[PDB]
Symmetry: C4
Subunit: 150 residues, 4 copies
Amino acid sequence: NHFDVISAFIKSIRGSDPDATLYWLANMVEAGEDPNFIFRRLLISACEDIGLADPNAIVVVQSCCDAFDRVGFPEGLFFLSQASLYLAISPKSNSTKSIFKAMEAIKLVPNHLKNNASNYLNPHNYLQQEYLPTDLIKFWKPKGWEKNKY
Amino acid sequence: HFDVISAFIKSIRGSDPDATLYWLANMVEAGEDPNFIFRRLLISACEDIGLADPNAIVVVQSCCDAFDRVGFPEGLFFLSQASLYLAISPKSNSTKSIFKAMEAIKSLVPNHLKNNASNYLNPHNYQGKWLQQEYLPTDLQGIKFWKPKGWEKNKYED
Amino acid sequence: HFDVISAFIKSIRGSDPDATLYWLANMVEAGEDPNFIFRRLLISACEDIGLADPNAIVVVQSCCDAFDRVGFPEGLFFLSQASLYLAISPKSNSTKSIFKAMEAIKSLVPNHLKNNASNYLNPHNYQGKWLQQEYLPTDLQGIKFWKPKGWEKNKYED
Amino acid sequence: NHFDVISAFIKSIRGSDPDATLYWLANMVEAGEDPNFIFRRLLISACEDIGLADPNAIVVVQSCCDAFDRVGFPEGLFFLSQASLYLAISPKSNSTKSIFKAMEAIKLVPNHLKNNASNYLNPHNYLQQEYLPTDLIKFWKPKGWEKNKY
């Protein structure tokens, strides 16, 4: 049941609602919830829910955890609030979970991709060349920063 | 001692790099613990700059780490970089919002927002433009805890 | 094993996110050490992306730190973020330059460039537009070890 | 005398010369110079020579040291080269040394700046208010990012 509050909190972040985020956040801290337990979920969210929409999201959130470590309560509340608000208002993407589609397919390396392959063409020196095996298909599904990169 | 550190943070909050430097210099002559100064700088990076530039906490944290690796005398420049950086950043106190919501708390979880809820819809699966779903309890929908004033503006406008 | 990791780095170098993911997935099914994968990702962030985006090393390092804090199963997403991020970044091998200069070495310090040199002039004191001062030995002036190809371009143009 | 090489290396960075930087860099590593000794000077340079011209310079350089730690030679050479090139081509400023002018002057807090001062005006709530003592003057001398902030 405190799993229910942190769930409401993370779904609020995922839904881009900074008000509900703070509300569930305040709920957890009036309840004396463990801050490392909040931070671990923020980190995961920074990569599972924001991810390549803003690839510096994990950087900001880690700085907020480190800062919290040095500082603790009552002041640390600001790190919790910045990191929570920061994820709530960021653009969203779950394209980092594309790894699971690839793990499903997995469940032999082309020659040109072998270590010290003799017929590898280095893209820096220059491109058509195949990176998947012959018998294989799109695993990565882009949805922010990843849009421009795409 | 606690007045000097106060004048330091207020000069930063007031966007005064010169006074910022003067109270920093005061503090180190007087033997103040650099870890203590870095605590207040980390705090002020979220409390006084905050989402006006959420990179501020990364830069200051990295100044703090640089100081742990180098120590004095050269550590004095990382105190100075961190301090100057906050003094000249745009300011916002919007992270103080959490206290507003905390006052609203001082509250059951809606069913669709519980862990593993069967009626929860996931914005990542959503083929539309905005998933309309309740995130606050019903008696509170519409209530506003956060408004931005820099980087928070742009993010808000989207 | 060393062929799989090779195909992984080459897919990243080739800007292929799909193949990148497939060889990542291959590696973790096979039990590959995540620290080993992160080493190659840190390396590739400087060798293959490099000054095309010097933030790449910060992001990947931070993925690595996130993995140390979280471990599996959720650590798999930080491997994935780091990997995908390099696959889609602009590429540059311009940090390989150091090997060129290393070949020129395989050499006394000019006097004005020695520690505490009395004839050294400091670009920070310089009231002009560009301090013309020798940084290479005289028999080497004009020689070029680095050319950019992204972020390195802009920095170069200045 | 290996102090002479690292000096040539740092002055080359300070002079914005990426070629000479690499040259002295290669010199230090063919000599088996200690990489922590190179990195410590890069860090200092990232703040004393680049500083607020690019305030993420210390971030990049620290990531390059951490990466080097995990990896070592021969591959680590890339972290050394990226961080060295990165500082060489960055815009330059020594405005972080302005702290020493202030330490010279130092060698009593206005009331409104005291802890819990009754007549402090908070800039968030709103500005003319004095941050230096009455008897005091410009310490900070901006020269990149600090230009825009100024």
